[PDB]
Amino acid sequence: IETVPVKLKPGMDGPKVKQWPLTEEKIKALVEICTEMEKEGKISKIGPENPYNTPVFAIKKDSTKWRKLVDFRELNKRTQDFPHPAGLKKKKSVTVLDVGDAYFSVPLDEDFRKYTAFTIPSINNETPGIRYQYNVLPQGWKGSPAIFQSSMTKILEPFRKQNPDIVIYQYMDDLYVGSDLEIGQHRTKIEELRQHLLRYELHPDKWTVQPIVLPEKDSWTVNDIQKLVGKLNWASQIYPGIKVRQLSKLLRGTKALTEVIPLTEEAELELAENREILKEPVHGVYYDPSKDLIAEIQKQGQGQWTYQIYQEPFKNLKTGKYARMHTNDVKQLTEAVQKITTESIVIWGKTPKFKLPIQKETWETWWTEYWQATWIPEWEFVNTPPLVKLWYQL
Amino acid sequence: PISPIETVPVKLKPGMDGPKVKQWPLTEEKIKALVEICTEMEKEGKISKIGPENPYNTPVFAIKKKDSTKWRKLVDFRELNKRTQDFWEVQLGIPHPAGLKKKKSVTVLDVGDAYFSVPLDEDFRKYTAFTIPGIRYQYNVLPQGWKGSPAIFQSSMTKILEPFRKQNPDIVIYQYMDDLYVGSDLEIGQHRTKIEELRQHLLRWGLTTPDKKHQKEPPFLWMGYELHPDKWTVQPIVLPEKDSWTVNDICKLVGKLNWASQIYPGIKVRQLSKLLRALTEVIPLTEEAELELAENREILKEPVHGVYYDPSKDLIAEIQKQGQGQWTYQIYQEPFKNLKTGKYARMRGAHTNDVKQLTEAVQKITTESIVIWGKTPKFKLPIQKETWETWWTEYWQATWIPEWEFVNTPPLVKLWYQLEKEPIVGAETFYVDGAANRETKLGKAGYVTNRGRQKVVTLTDTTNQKTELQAIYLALQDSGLEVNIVTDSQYALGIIQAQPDQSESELVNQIIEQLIKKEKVYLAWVPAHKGIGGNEQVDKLVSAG
DNA sequence: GGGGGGCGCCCGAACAGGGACTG
DNA sequence: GTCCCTGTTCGGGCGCCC
Lengths: 394, 545
Ligand SMILES: Nc1ccn([C@H]2C[C@H](O)[C@@H](COP(=O)(O)OP(=O)(O)OP(=O)(O)O)O2)c(=O)n1
Ligand SMILES: [Mg+2]
What we know:
- It is classed as viral protein.
- Keywords: HIV-1 reverse transcriptase NRTI polymerase DNA complex, viral protein.
- It forms a tetrameric assembly.
- The entry is titled "HIV-1 wild-type reverse transcriptase-DNA complex with dCTP".
- The structure holds two protein chains of two kinds.
- By secondary structure, chain A is an alpha+beta fold.
- Chain A has four domains: 1-81 and 104-144, HIV Type 1 Reverse Transcriptase, subunit A, domain 1 (HIV Type 1 Reverse Transcriptase, Chain A, domain 1); 87-103 and 145-201, 2-Layer Sandwich (Alpha-Beta Plaits), CATH 3.30.70; 202-287, Reverse transcriptase/Diguanylate cyclase domain (Alpha-Beta Plaits); 288-391, Reverse transcriptase/Diguanylate cyclase domain (Alpha-Beta Plaits, 2-Layer Sandwich), CATH 3.30.70.
- Chain A is built from ten helices and 15 strands.
- Chain A has a five-stranded mixed β-sheet with strand order 13-12-11-14-15. In chain A, strands 1-6-5 form a three-stranded antiparallel β-sheet, covered by helices on one side.
- In chain A, strand 14, helix 9 (360-366) and strand 15 form a beta-alpha-beta unit.
- The longest helix of chain A has 20 residues, at 143-162.
- Chain A starts with 23 loop residues before the first helix and ends with a helix.
- Chain B is of the alpha+beta class.
- Chain B has five domains: 1-90 and 116-149, HIV Type 1 Reverse Transcriptase, Chain A, domain 1; 91-115 and 150-218, Reverse transcriptase/Diguanylate cyclase domain (Alpha-Beta Plaits, 2-Layer Sandwich); 219-309, Alpha-Beta Plaits (2-Layer Sandwich), CATH 3.30.70.270; 310-416, Reverse transcriptase/Diguanylate cyclase domain (Alpha-Beta Plaits), CATH 3.30.70.270; 417-542, 2-Layer Sandwich (Nucleotidyltransferase, domain 5), CATH 3.30.420.10.
- In chain B, 30% of the residues lie in helices and 21% in strands.
- In chain B, a hairpin with a 6-residue loop joins strand 18 (428-436) and strand 19 (443-449).
- In chain B, helix 10 (464-477) packs parallel to helix 12.
- The longest helix of chain B is centred in the N-terminal third of the chain and has 20 residues, at 148-167.
- The radius of gyration of chain B is 32 Å and the shape is elongated.
- The structure holds 2'-deoxycytidine-5'-triphosphate (DCP) and magnesium ion.
- 2'-deoxycytidine-5'-triphosphate is lined by residues 65, 110-115, 144, 177-178, 213 of chain B.
- Chain B binds a DNA duplex through strand 2, helix 3, helix 5 and helix 10.
C-alpha cells in the first residue's frame, strides 16, 4: 500500500482555522477516540511548528458511541480537484451507510499530512491544546473517496453483480444504497451488504416540490390586492408569463387599505391564468457542475421552513418545504440544512452552499449540538428581506 | 539545567535571512545585570560565544521581574519574528479559578528559568545572535522575545507532563506556561508525596522547581488571584485617579474595569468607552462618563469573592439589564454564592432592540460557560415567557435561547411596540415616498393619504434611503394614534419591521419614538414605479428632482 | 522604556454584498 | 456600472497571565 501524491490548488496554502470551544462530553469522547486512533498509528501527535489547523468536534448518534467529525471544509476547498446515477433519486427506499472507517486502511501522502492538523481543547484551558495529524485517509476530506475509489469498486463489484437492481452511490464517508424492495426486503439487503463489508431511512420519491401558490378569497381589499401584485411582480422574475397590469389597474387612485375591491372580470381571469403559470414547470434551467449549488432557507414560522436550490438567481433547480412541530429554531434549521443537503447529494451528488437566516454567533454557538451528518456543507449568514419570506408562504 | 527533550524543527519564512540589527546602547546597571546572566548561561551551555561566521545580531535589554531583585533578559527579536515561520499557537485560552473544583490538597509550583531550560533547534541558533556590550553570543535555548518560544515551550511542557498525567489521572495539573496548579483529593501527606514525584519528574526533564516559588499553604497566589480553600479573590484592582485623563489613561481604566468585572457585579464602561471615538490625546470626561466612573469606584470598594465549581450541581446564570445596551451577569450554583460575574455591552447593528441584545448576551455567556465548565448554564432572565414568544413569532430569523426561567427583577426586557399583522380599519392610509438626486444631494420626502392630505418636505445633503425613512417619519408625525403606512422602500421596511428600540441613526431614533407613542401601526410594502396608486401619486410629487 | 504568546474589551479601517438609480 | 448602508474581519491600542 504505497501512497498517491496529493497537491493543493496552485497559489493556495493549507487551512488555518481556530478550534471552537467544545463541551466536556465532546472533549472526553475526542480524547478517548484520539487515543485509540493514535494506538493504531492512524494519527500522530505534532508540535506547533506545523502552522495548519482544522476544527474537530464529535457527535453522539440513542447510543454509547461517539463519532469524531473533522470540519475539513477549507481543506476540501483547497485540495487539487478530482459517477452520478440519475436512478438513485427514484428508489422507494434509500439507506445511508457510514463507510468512513474504510479510509483508515490506506495511508496518506507524507507531504500532505501536515495540512490535516487538528487540535483538542481542554476544559477551562487546564492544558494547551493537544495537536494531532493524520497518517491515513481522513474521514471528511474529499481526497479520501478519490484515492479509495479504486478499492471501493473492487468491494461492491460482486454485490452489484448479484444485485444489479440495487444502486450504490458513494459521497465522502457516505454510502447511499437504494432499492425498489418492500421495506424488510430492503432492510435484509442492507444488512446483507454491511455484513458483506465487514468481510436509516430514506425515500427519494416521496420528496415534494413546493409550488408558488396564490391566495383564493371571495372579497379582496386594497391591501389584499397590493400584497398580491407585490407577490406576482417578483414571481415575474422566476416565471416570465405572470401579469399584473389588470390587477394593478384596480389600485388606481389612493384608496384606504381596508377598502374592498370588486374584481373586474378581466383581472378575475388574469388572476386565474397566473395561477396556472405557477403550476407549469419552470423553463430553461440546466444543472451545471462547474458552479456550486446555492440554497436559501426562509423561516415561515410555526415550524415551517421553505427552501430553494438554484445556481443562478431565479433559476431554481428545486424549491421545497420542510415542516416540524419547546420548539428550537436552531435545531430545526440544522435539521433542515441536513435534509436539504442530503436531497442535494442524492440528486446532483454535490453539496449546496447555504444562505442561512440566522445570526452567525447564534448558529456557531449551537449547530453542532444537532448535527448528525458525516459531511458539513459550506454556509454563509444572511439577513433576509422580510419580502422574500412571503413570496414562498403556504 | 537543559531539558533532554527533542528540539522543535523551525525554519525562516522562505527567501528571507536572519536579522542584522545594531545593538542599541544600554544602561550600565543593565549591562552588569546582563553579563551576570550571560556568564552563567554560558557555563551551562545555554548560550555559546560566536565569531564572524555569524553575520547576524539582534538588540537585547533587561527588565526587573515581579521579584524586586532578579533581572529578566529579553531580546527585541521584532525583526527575526517577521522572518520566522508561522506556528500554530497551542494556548487556547486562560484558565479561570471559577472552573476549579474543590480539592483536598493544593500546590502551586513555578519553574525556575523555564525557557532557558528548553533547547532551541540547532539549525536556527544562528539567527538568535546577540551582543553584550564586549562579548558576542547565540542562544542554544529558547529566547524571551522570539515568537516561536511560547508555543514551543507550551508544547514541550505538555509532552513532559503527559507521562505523569497518564500515570496519575486523578491528580489535576492546571498548566499555564511554567506555572502549575496541582490538585488532589489526597490527605496532605500523600499529596506532598505526589508533589515530590511531580517535581522530580520535571527535574528529570530539566525543569527545576525552586522552593521559593513552591506554595504549600493557602492562600495560593495563582494566575492573578488568591485561592483560598472555599473561595477565591482577585488580587486588588487599583484604578488610577489622574484628574486629567488621556486616551491612554482611559484605555487603562477601561481595561482594569473589564478585568474587574469577572467578579465585580455592576461594572459599566459604555460611557467611558464612548469617549475614545492617537494615544497622547487628552479628552475631557463627560458627565455621564464621570458619573459612571464614580459608580464603578463605589463598586470596587466592596469586598467580594468567587466560589469553586461543584459539577454535581447546576450552572445558573442570571442577567441584569443595565441600560443603553449594557448587561451584567452572575454565574452561580448556590444563591448569592457567585462562581463568577461578567458584562456584555457590545453594540452590533446600526439598529437593534433589547431582545436581540439579550439573545447576544445569552450567546456570549453560553460560549464562555462552555470554555470554563464545559457545559451550558440554566438561565434566569428578566424577560417574560410571552415577550420572547412574541418576538420569536414576529421575527423572520431563527433565534433561540436555551433552558431558562423568568425573574421579576427590573428593568424587564420588552418589545416597545408591535407592528400590526393586518391593516387597521379606520386609520388614515399614508402612501409615503422619497427621492434624492445623486449629483446635488437635494431630495424630497412626503406622502399622500386616502383622505386627500398631501405634503412634501425638501431635504438637503440627503440620500435615497434617508428620504424614504424621512417619508415614513413624516407620516408618523402627521398621523393619528392609528396609521396605515404604505412604503415601496425595501430598505426602510426591513429596518422598521425588525422592531428596533435603539439606533445609531438620529432619524431612526426619532422614528422609534413615534412608533412607541402610536397605538396601532401597519406597514405594507409595494413595488416601486408600477403605477400602483397611490404610490404613483406620491412618486410624482416627490420626484421633481 | 523597549521583547513574546495567549485570552478579553473597545475602536476604526477595509472590503463584501444587496438595493436603488441613470437613461 | 455608482452610491448607499450594513455586516464582517482584522489590526491597533489597552487589561490580565506567564
Ligand atoms: N514578561 C514575560 C514573562 C514571562 N515570559 C516567559 C519566559 C519565561 O521563562 C516564562 C515563565 O515566566 P516566569 O515569570 O516564571 O519566568 P522564568 O521561568 O524564566 O523565571 P523564574 O525563575 O523567575 O521563574 O514565560 C515572557 O516571555 N515574558
Ligand atoms: Mg518560572
